[PDB]
C-alpha cells in the first residue's frame, strides 16, 4: 500500500527520465480478437474476449502530479466530471490546446519538463464476469494515451507506458477482482517523450484512442506473421506464416492456417510447433511456420485491393479449438530495383497526401466515419498513397486501406525539429532505447498490413548514428518494405529513396550543410542510383499548389521520378463558439496558448469538415489515370493504370463554340493497363459563326465502386478546336470643371477631372457604382506571400513584405492627364495616372475610354511597371457595384476559382454559379475566387467582354487583408469585383520562401489589355 | 526517508528489469582526470581533483536483498566485516564461485533470477574537503560492479547501475556533506544482465575494479575525440580534435589542443566554441573541433608503438585555466581495401590471442603489475594483437598496449550463449536497448586508443536484428575502425571481417544452419570478398596446439587469410588450500558450485601464474618475424616486420654433428621490412666422421627494448646438412622352465616364459627394472581426447570413448610365441603376443631381443593393428625403471615437450634438463612431456639408441588417467619409461570433436621400430 501511493510511485519521475519508457508493459503484437471459434474469426464477427471500457469515465484535472490527492487511488473525488473516453481534455476545457510547429511547447532542458505538467485523473468502474477470472490471461489496451501516464487497478499500481501512439497493454490478471473493479488512469501532458514529439500539430493530452479489455487463454497465439513469396510472373505465390506461442508447449498443440478467398478455402497447412535450426543451440520451440501454395493468386493493389482472409487456429491434435486469430492478407510485392519502386514488377506513380489525424470537433480522437470519408475523398480525386504523418495511426485506418486501396507509408513517432541542432538527440546513444522502441513497436504492431508499403523512420529529426541503427534494425527484421527518412538532407545511408521536404522541379536551393536540389538534377548527382520520392510537396497553406503541373510533368517524364505526397489532407483547425453560440474555425493562438505558429496549422487539401478546396480539383486533374493526345481528329488514350483494364470506363466527348454545345458522344473505353486506345471522332461540326471551337473529353464511369457513386468523372482534357476569327445615336459629352460627363439615352458616364476616374454610371436614374474604378496593383496577401513572415521579427524577402517596403499598398496615384473628345461616332476619354511612394514613381498607367453610340464602352489600358519595384500582383481595375445579384454567369475558365499557375482543371466553358460560390472562405481571408481566361463576363445587368482575369465577391481586398479569421468577415453594402488584365502566380513550392517561378511574375516593364464594358 | 529505504526502492526490482538498465548513471565518455595545470596533464602526474577510495571497506554478506536490515542504510552493521576494495567477495569465501561455460548459472526465465540471489553490502566511510563542496561537481566512479548494485550515500538512494565490465558514474554534489560521509553499495549476483553475461568463465560478484572520486569545475570538459587523417603516403598528417562541453557557455571561452612528442610540442590550434553547420538549426554551441597538421608524423604501430601527447585545455580569452585533459594519441589508419585489412597502407597479419582478465589469487581483479607482465610475456613471445575476452577491458590495460605496442579487438559484454535459440534475446527489441547500452558505452570509453583498431560486437549470441542495428551505430560513429561479429555462421551482414570460431584449414564442418567451412574454402565461396581472421583457433586446453604449423602455413600463403586469435592467454584457475595448507590450482565443481563444466576453464598458453606450457614456445615460433630459407650455402632471410628496420638485430648461426658444435658465426641482421637478405655462410666443415650435420640459426637481439632484456633470442630454424652413413665374451643363454637367462659379465637378463616379457635386468646384483617391458598401446587420455565426453553423458566419437568401446585399456596380451636361440655371438629371443578384447584380437606385437657379447640388446618390434579397431595412441614400449635420477640427457629434439603435430619449435640438439624438467605439471593430469625425434637417450646408467619419442617422468599412465588434479599426484617408486616408435598426434583446432588430422592418426596396420638398450 505504501509502495501503491502517489508519493512512492511518482518520486522517480519516468516521465523526465528517458531510460524508461515503459514499466510492466506487454510485449507490441498484430491486432489481436482471441476468437474461440473458427468461423466467427473468418467472418471478422464480434468477439466475445474483445471488451470496449469506451464509454463514459470520470475525470479530474490538475495543475500536476503533486496536487492529486491520494484518496484518488481509493475513491472518485468529488470534484471529478463525467466524460468520453476516447477523447482529448483540451477539447473539453480543461485546459488550452497549443499549436506550434518547430518551437517545444515547453522549456527546452531535456529530459527535464515543467513542474507545472497538467494532469488528467481518468476512473473508471466496471464489472468482470467470474469466467474471466476463473482461468486465461485478461489485459487491458490502451491505443493511445497523449503523452504518459501511470495505472492503477483497485488501488495497486500497475504500469506506466510513455509512447503516445502506440497501443500500451498491461496484464491485469493478478488485479482484477470478482464483481466490481475500479481503474485509475494518472495521464501526464508532458514527459521526456514530448521531445520526440515535436511534430507540427495541435498539442494535445488525454486518453484519445480506444481503451479494451482482452480475455486470452493461458496456452494462447502471441504472435504470427505472414508473408506472401512469388515467382517471376506471379502466377504462383507462396503463404508463409510464423505463428508463435505463449505458455505451456504441449505434444497436442498444433497451429492450422487456412487462407480463404471470399467463403472458398484456397489453401491450408497443419504443423505441430518446433521451427528450422537456427543456430548451434537448436530452433524455437515456442514457434512454426506454415507455407501454403496459392496457385494463380489475385494480387492486391490500390487498383485492384484483392484481399485474402488468414485464419490462424490454434488447437489440440484431437482437434478442439483454443484460439483463433485472423487476419486480412493481399499478394503484392514491394520492391526498389535498378533505382525504381515496383509493385508487383511494375514502377509506381505515387499519387499521394500527407495525412493528420484531426477532427475539428474531437480533436485528434478517431472515428470509423471519418477516416472512410477521407479514404473515399482521396480516391475520388485520383490519390493513391497516403502518409501517415509522423506517427503510427489508429489500427483501423491500415485495415480501411487494405480493404479499399490505398497505398500507406507508415512512420514512427520520432519528430525533433526544435532541437538545436535538430539530431541532438537522435545522436546521442541515451535516446535510442526510446527512439528504437518507438520504431520497432511501431513495425511489430502493422508490419502484417498489405496497405503499409514503406517503413519510415519518422520526421525532422536531423542524421544520426541512431537512425541508421534503426533503419538497419528495419532492413532486418522485415526485408518485404523499403524504409525512408528524411532528415539530414533526404539522401543519406538511412534511407532507400532520396525524399525531400518541397524540393522544387527546375531551382536549386544549395542551404549551407542541407542542400535542397531540383529533384532533376538531384537524380544525376554523381552516385546517386535511388528513386526519388517526395515525402512533402506542394504546401496547401490556403490558395496554394501553383506549380503542381510542373510537379506532375516532371514526374511523368523522368522515370526515378515516381511521385510524392501532398503536404497534405485536411487543415488542422478547430471549432470554438462565440458570444452568440456560433462555430468557428480556430487556428494558432486563438486558445491563449504559448507562443505559436499562427495559421500554419491550416495546410489542407479539405477543409476540417472534410469541403474540398479549390486545389483539390487541380490535384485531381494532374493526378488523373488517363493521358490524352489530340492529332487532328484523332484522340489518343493512354491509360496510366498498371494492373486494371479499363473496365469501367467511358468516354464522353463534347464540342462546343461558346458554350454552345454543337457535338456530343460517347465511345466504351477498351484499353489494357499502360496501352493505348485511338478513337476516331465522326465528322466534326465546321461552323460558320465566328468564335473558337473547344473538344472536351470526360471520362466517366458508368457503374459505382466501393469509394464512387454511378456516373463518377475520373478523368478529363480540352483542347482548342479549329477558331474562325471575327471578321465583322450619338452620344453626348457634357463638360464642365469637376467632371466629365457623357450621356447616350438612359445611359450617363461620369469621369472625375480632380482623381481622373470614372466616378460614377447611371441607368436610368439607378447608381451603378459605390466606389470608382480605379487601377489595382496589390491583392490581399497570400500565405504564400506571407510566408513566415510578421510585424516582431519580418522576413524581407517576403513577397507581401517587399511590396510594402516598395509601398504598393501605400502608393497614391497622381493624375497625368485627362482629356475628352467626341469622335464622329463616340467620345474619347484619355487619362493618364502615376502611382508613387516617396518621390518614386511605381506604376504608371494611360487609360483610353471610348463610349460608342451601342453603349459600349472600351477601355485600353497601357501600364509601365519601373524595373526596380518588386514585381506587382496583377495589373487590373478594381470597384465597388451598388448592385448585389444572385447569379453570376461568365464565359472562360472554371467553374472553380483559378489562377495562372493553378488553371490546369479548370475548363473553359459557361459557367453559372451563385455569388457566394464565387468566394473561397478560407479560414485566413486573402485574395480568393479569381478566374482566369475569361473572355465574357456578366453580373445582373452588366457584361464585361475581351480576355481577362476577375474574382466578384462582397468583400474588398482592403477588408481581406486587414482580417484575420473568416467570420469576422462582413458582407459590404455591394458587389466588389476585380477584373484583371494580368495576375501573379500564387506559388506553393513552400510556403516560408518565395515560391512563385519567375514565368508566373509580372516581370515585365509594360503590360496591355482591353475590355468592353456594356 | 521512506522512498530512500530499502522497502521502496526494492519494491520496483530493477535487477529483473531489461527496460531499465541504469538510474541516474552520467554519461560515458573518455578517462579524465580533471587536472589544473597544462604540465601535469602533459607529463600525466597524479591529479588532486581524482581520488582513489580503494582500501578497506566494511562489507556484509545476505542470501537476499530481502534480508538486509534498514539499518545498514544509517549506520555500518556489527556483523559487517572489513574487505579489500577492489575484489570480488568469491575470493573472500562469502559464497562459492560457479564455473559454467554454456548453461546459464541461474535458471533460464528471462528477464526473472532467483529469489535467493546473493548480496553483498559494502559501506565506506570517508572525509571530502569543503573546497571540493565550495564549487564544482563531485562525481563518484565504480570502474566495475559485478553484476548490479544500488548507492546510497548519506541514507539518501542515488541510482542504480547494471552493467558489469564498463565504469558507472554518479553525480554526488546533491548528497555529499562537510566532513564525515558514508557510502553504501548493494550488490546483487544476479540480474537481468546475466542473462548478457554467458561467456565461458568464473561466475563471480562485487566491487572487482577501482571505485574513485572525480572533481570537475562546473564548466568542464564533458567529452573530446581525436582523429588522425592521412595522405596517400602518410607524409603529412592531420588531427582533428572535437572537443565537448558541459555548463554556461560563455565567450570568453576557449579550447586549446597541443599535441607533443615528447618534451617538444609540434603543433597547437585555438578556438571559441561553436562547431559549423550540422543541419537546418545550425550546428553544436557546446563543441569545437580543432584541426591540427602534422608534416611526417611518426606512425604507431606494434612494431613501433609512436605515441604523441595531446593536451586538451579549457581556458578563457585572457590565459586562465579552468581544466586540462589528456590522452595518448598514435597516428595510424585501420582500414580494410580490396579484402585485406591494412595498417598504415600495409596488409596485417595478426598474431593474436584471447585474454581474459583472470587471477588465480584475487579473481577478476586486475592489477597493473599483472597486466605488464603478460604484455611483456606475449611480446617476447611474437604475439602482436589481443582479443578482449567477451567483455571491455581495466583501462589501464588500453594504455598498456598504445605505450607498448599490441592490436587490440574491443568486444561488447553481450554473450548468450545458453539462450536456446542463442539469438532468443538478441532477435528481440525488448532486449535491444540492453545490448546497445553495452555496445555504446564501450566505444565512447575507448574510442580515443590507438592500441584498438577492430569492435567487437560479443561473442555467441546468434544473429539477431540487435547486432544488425549496432553494427551499423559502430560504422557510422566511428568510421576508423571496422566491426566483427562471429555469431550465426561468422559471416553475416554484421561483420566487416569473416571471424570463425575454429574453423579447420582443410576439413569442412558442415553444421545445418551454421557451417564452419575450411579457412580455404571459405575465402572463395561464391560472392565471398571479406578477409578472414579467427577470432578464436587452436584451442589451448592442456596438452594442445598440434596443427598450428598448418594454420600458419596457410596464414602465409594466402593473403586473405589475415591471422588469428588463439584461444586463449591464460588459464582461468584458482588456488585452493588442502587441509596442511598448501595451494593448489582448482577449476570448476572444485567449489561445490551448481553444474560446473570442470576444466574446459583451463585453455590457456601459460598457468595462471603466468609460468609458460610448452605450446607457448611453438606458437613463439610459428609466429615468428622472420622467415628462414636454404639454398646450398646461402641463408635468405625474409622480414616480416612491415615498418621497422632489423636495427636491433643479429643472425647467430651454427654447424653441429650431434650435438658437437663444429661451426659458428654471427652476422649483422639488415633487412628492410617485407625484404630479403642473402646470407653466404663460409666454407662449411666436411666431417669424416658418421653423422647428420646440422645447420641452427637464430636470431638475437643485442640490446633491449621496452618489453624485452639484451640477448632476446625472437626467431630461429633449423635444416639437415650433409649426412654420411655409418659404415661400420658371448652371452650365455640358461634355460628354465619359467624363465629365460642370458648372463654377460656383470649383466643379466630374465625373460619371463609365461607373460613372454623381459622381467628383470641385473647389473652386479642391482635389480634395474621395477615393471616388466612390455608393449603400450594407449596413454593416459588428453583433455583434446576427452573432448567434453564425460561419465553421464559421454560422447561415442571422443577418442578415449572409442578406445574404451574397443577396449584398448582392457585389453589382455596372450602369449603367442616365446623362443630363446643362442647363435654364434648373441643370443636371439622371439615373442609374439595378441592382445585381445572379448574374441577380438585388435594388437599384435613380434619382437626380437638380440644381446650381443657388446652388453648391447638390440630390440625389433614389429606390431600389426587390426583396420577395424579404432586407431592406436601409440605404439612404443613402456617400464618402470627401479633408478630415479636428477639428470636427463638425449640427443634429438627439445628441450621441450614436443608431440608429431607439436614439434616444429623443437630443435635437433644435445639435452641436458633435470628429471623435473622432463615433466608439464598440467592442472588436469595427463599423457605429457614427450620428446620426438630422439636418437639417443641417456639415464643415469642406461642408454637407449635408435629413433624414437620417450617421456619419463615418476608418474605413470594409469595414475594419470586416474587422478583428476595435478596436487593428487604423487612421485611413484621408480621411474616410468614410455619409449615409443610411434606417437599419435595431440590435436587442438577444438577440444569437443575429434581434432587430430589423418596423416598424424597411426592409421597403417603395421608398424615397425627397432631400439638398443645398453
Ligand atoms: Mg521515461
Ligand atoms: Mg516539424
Ligand atoms: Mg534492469
Ligand atoms: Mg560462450
Ligand atoms: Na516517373
Ligand atoms: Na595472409
Redesign the interface.
Known amino acids: 500500500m505504501?509502495?501503491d501511493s502517489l508519493?512512492?510511485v511518482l518520486?522517480?519521475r519516468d516521465w523526465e527520465?528517458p531510460?524508461?519508457?515503459?514499466?510492466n508493459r506487454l510485449?507490441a503484437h498484430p491486432p489481436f480478437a482471441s476468437w474461440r471459434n473458427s468461423e466467427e474469426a473468418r467472418t471478422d464477427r464480434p468477439s466475445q474476449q474483445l471488451r470496449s471500457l469506451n464509454g463514459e469515465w470520470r475525470f479530474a484535472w490538475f495543475p500536476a502530479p503533486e496536487a492529486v490527492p491520494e484518496s484518488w487511488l481509493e475513491c472518485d473525488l468529488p470534484e471529478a466530471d463525467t466524460v468520453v473516453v476516447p477523447s482529448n481534455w483540451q477539447m473539453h476545457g480543461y485546459d488550452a490546446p497549443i499549436y506550434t510547429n518547430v518551437t517545444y511547447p515547453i522549456t527546452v532542458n531535456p529530459p527535464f519538463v515543467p513542474t507545472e505538467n497538467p494532469t488528467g485523473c481518468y476512473s473508471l468502474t466496471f464489472n468482470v464476469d467470474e469466467s474471466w477470472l476463473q482461468e486465461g490471461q485478461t489485459r487491458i489496451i490502451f491505443d493511445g494515451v497523449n503523452s504518459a501516464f501511470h495505472l492503477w487497478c483497485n488501488g495497486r499500481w500497475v504500469g506506466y507506458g510513455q509512447d503516445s501512439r502506440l497501443p500500451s497493454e498491461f496484464d491485469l490478471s493478478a488485479f482484477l477482482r470478482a464483481g466490481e473493479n475500479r481503474l485509475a488512469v494518472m495521464v501526464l501532458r508532458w514527459s521526456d517523450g514530448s521531445y520526440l514529439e515535436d511534430q507540427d500539430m495541435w498539442r494535445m493530452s488525454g486518453i484519445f484512442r480506444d481503451v479494451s479489455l482482452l480475455h486470452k487463454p493461458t496456452t494462447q497465439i502471441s504472435d504470427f506473421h505472414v508473408a506472401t513469396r512469388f515467382n517471376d510472373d506471379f502466377s504462383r505465390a507462396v503463404l508463409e506464416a510464423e505463428v508463435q506461442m505463449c505458455g505451456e508447449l504441449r505434444d497436442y498443440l498444433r497451429v492450422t492456417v487456412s487462407l480463404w478467398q471470399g467463403e472458398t478455402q484456397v489453401a491450408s497447412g497443419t504443423a505441430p510447433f518446433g521451427g528450422?535450426?537456427?543456430?548451434?543451440?537448436?530452433?524455437?520451440?515456442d514457434r512454426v511456420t506454415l507455407r501454403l501454395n496459392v496457385e494463380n493468386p489475385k494480387l492486391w493493389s490500390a487498383e485492384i485491393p484483392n484481399l485474402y482472409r488468414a485464419v490462424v487456429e490454434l488447437h489440440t491434435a484431437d482437434g478442439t479449438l483454443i484460439e483463433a486469430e485472423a487476419c486480412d492478407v493481399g499478394f503484392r510485392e514491394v520492391r526498389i530495383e535498378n533505382g525504381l519502386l515496383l509493385l508487383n514488377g511494375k514502377p509506381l506513380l505515387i499519387r499521394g497526401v500527407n495525412r493528420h489525424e484531426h477532427h475539428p470537433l474531437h480533436g485528434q480522437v478517431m472515428d470509423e466515419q471519418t477516416m472512410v470519408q477521407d479514404i473515399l475523398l482521396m480516391k475520388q480525386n485520383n490519390f493513391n498513397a497516403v502518409r501517415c504523418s509522423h506517427y503510427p495511426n489508429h489500427p483501423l485506418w491500415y485495415t480501411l486501406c487494405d480493404r479499399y486501396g490505398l497505398y500507406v507509408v507508415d512512420e514512427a513517432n520520432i519528430e525533433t525539429?526544435?532541437?538545436?541542432?535538430?539530431?541532438?538527440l537522435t545522436d546521442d546513444?541515451?535516446w535510442?532505447?526510446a527512439m528504437?522502441?518507438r520504431v520497432?513497436?511501431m513495425v511489430?504492431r502493422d508490419r502484417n498490413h498489405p496497405s503499409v508499403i514503406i517503413w519510415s523512420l519518422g520526421n525532422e529529426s536531423?542524421?544520426?548514428?541512431?537512425h541508421?541503427?534503426?533503419?538497419?534494425?528495419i532492413?532486418?527484421?522485415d526485408p518485404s518494405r523499403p524504409v525512408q527518412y528524411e532528415?539530414?538532407?533526404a539522401d543519406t545511408?538511412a534511407t532507400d529513396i532520396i525524399c525531400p521536404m518541397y524540393a522544387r522541379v527546375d531551382e536549386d536551393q544549395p542551404?549551407?550543410?542541407?542542400p535542397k536540389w531540383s529533384i532533376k538534377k538531384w537524380l544525376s548527382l554523381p552516385g546517386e542510383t535511388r528513386p526519388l520520392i517526395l515525402c512533402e510537396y506542394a504546401h496547401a497553406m490556403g490558395n496554394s499548389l501553383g506549380g503542381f503541373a510542373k510537379y506532375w510533368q516532371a514526374f511523368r517524364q523522368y522515370p526515378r521520378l515516381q511521385g510524392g505526397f501532398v503536404w497534405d489532407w485536411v487543415d488542422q483547425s478547430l471549432i470554438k463558439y462565440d458570444e452568440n453560440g456560433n462555430p468557428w474555425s480556430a487556428y494558432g493562438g486563438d486558445f491563449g496558448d504559448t507562443p505559436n505558429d499562427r495559421q500554419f496549422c491550416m495546410n489542407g487539401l479539405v477543409f476540417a469538415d472534410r469541403t474540398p478546396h479549390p486545389a483539390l480539383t487541380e490535384a485531381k486533374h494532374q493526378q488523373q489515370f488517363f493521358q490524352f493526345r489530340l492529332s487532328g481528329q484523332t484522340i489518343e488514350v493512354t491509360s496510366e493504370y498498371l494492373f486494371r483494364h479499363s473496365d469501367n470506363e467511358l468516354l464522353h466527348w463534347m464540342v462546343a463554340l461558346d458554350g454552345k454545345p454543337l457535338a456530343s458522344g460517347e465511345v466504351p473505353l477498351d484499353v489494357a493497363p499502360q496501352g493505348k486506345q485511338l478513337i476516331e471522332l465522326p465528322e466534326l461540326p465546321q461552323p460558320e459563326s465566328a468564335g473558337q471551337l473547344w473538344l472536351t473529353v470526360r471520362v466517366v464511369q458508368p457503374n459505382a465502386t466501393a469509394w464512387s457513386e454511378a456516373g463518377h468523372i475520373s478523368a478529363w482534357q480540352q483542347w482548342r478546336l479549329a477558331e474562325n476569327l471575327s471578321v465583322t445615336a450619338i452620344p453626348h459629352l457634357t463638360t464642365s470643371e469637376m467632371d466629365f460627363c457623357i450621356e447616350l439615352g438612359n445611359k450617363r458616364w461620369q469621369f472625375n477631372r480632380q482623381s481622373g476616374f470614372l466616378s460614377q454610371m447611371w441607368i436610368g436614374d439607378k447608381k451603378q457604382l459605390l466606389t470608382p474604378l480605379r487601377d489595382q496593383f496589390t491583392r490581399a496577401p497570400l500565405d504564400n506571400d506571407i510566408g513566415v513572415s510578421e510585424a516582431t521579427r519580418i522576413d524581407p524577402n517576403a513577397w507581401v513584405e517587399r511590396w510594402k517596403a516598395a509601398g504598393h499598398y501605400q502608393a497614391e496615384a497622381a493624375l497625368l492627364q485627362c482629356t475628352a473628345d467626341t469622335l464622329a461616332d463616340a467620345v474619347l476619354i484619355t487619362t493618364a495616372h502615376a502611382w508613387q511612394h516617396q518621390g518614386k514613381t511605381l506604376f504608371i498607367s494611360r487609360k483610353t475610354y471610348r463610349i460608342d453610340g451601342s453603349g459600349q464602352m472600351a477601355i485600353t489600358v497601357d501600364v509601365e511597371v519601373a524595373s526596380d519595384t518588386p514585381h506587382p500582383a496583377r495589373i487590373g481595375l478594381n470597384c465597388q457595384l451598388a448592385q448585389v445579384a444572385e447569379r453570376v454567369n461568365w464565359l472562360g475558365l472554371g467553374p472553380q476559382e483559378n489562377y495562372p499557375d493553378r488553371l490546369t482543371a479548370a475548363c473553359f466553358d459557361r459557367w453559372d454559379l451563385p455569388l457566394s460560390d464565387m468566394y473561397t472562405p478560407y479560414v485566413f481571408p486573402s485574395e480568393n475566387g479569381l478566374r482566369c481566361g475569361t473572355r465574357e463576363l456578366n453580373y445582373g445587368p452588366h457584361q464585361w467582354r475581351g480576355d481577362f482575369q476577375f474574382n466578384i465577391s462582397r468583400y474588398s481586398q482592403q477588408q481581406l487583408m486587414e482580417t484575420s479569421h473568416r467570420h469576422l468577415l462582413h458582407a459590404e453594402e455591394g458587389t466588389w469585383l476585380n477584373i484583371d488584365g494580368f495576375h501573379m502566380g500564387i506559388g506553393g513550392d513552400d510556403s516560408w520562401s518565395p515560391s512563385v517561378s519567375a514565368e508566373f511574375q509580372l516581370s515585365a516593364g509594360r503590360y496591355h489589355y482591353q475590355l468592353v464594358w456594356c
Chains 1, 2 share one sequence.
Open positions: 505504501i509502495t508519493a512512492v518520486q522517480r527520465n531510460g524508461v519508457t515503459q514499466l510485449a528450422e535450426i537456427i543456430d548451434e543451440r537448436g530452433g524455437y520451440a525539429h526544435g532541437m538545436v541542432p535538430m539530431n541532438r546513444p541515451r535510442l532505447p528504437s522502441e520497432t513497436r511489430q536531423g542524421h544520426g548514428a541512431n541508421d541503427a534503426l533503419y538497419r534494425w532492413k532486418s527484421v532528415g539530414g538532407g545511408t542551404f549551407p550543410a542541407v
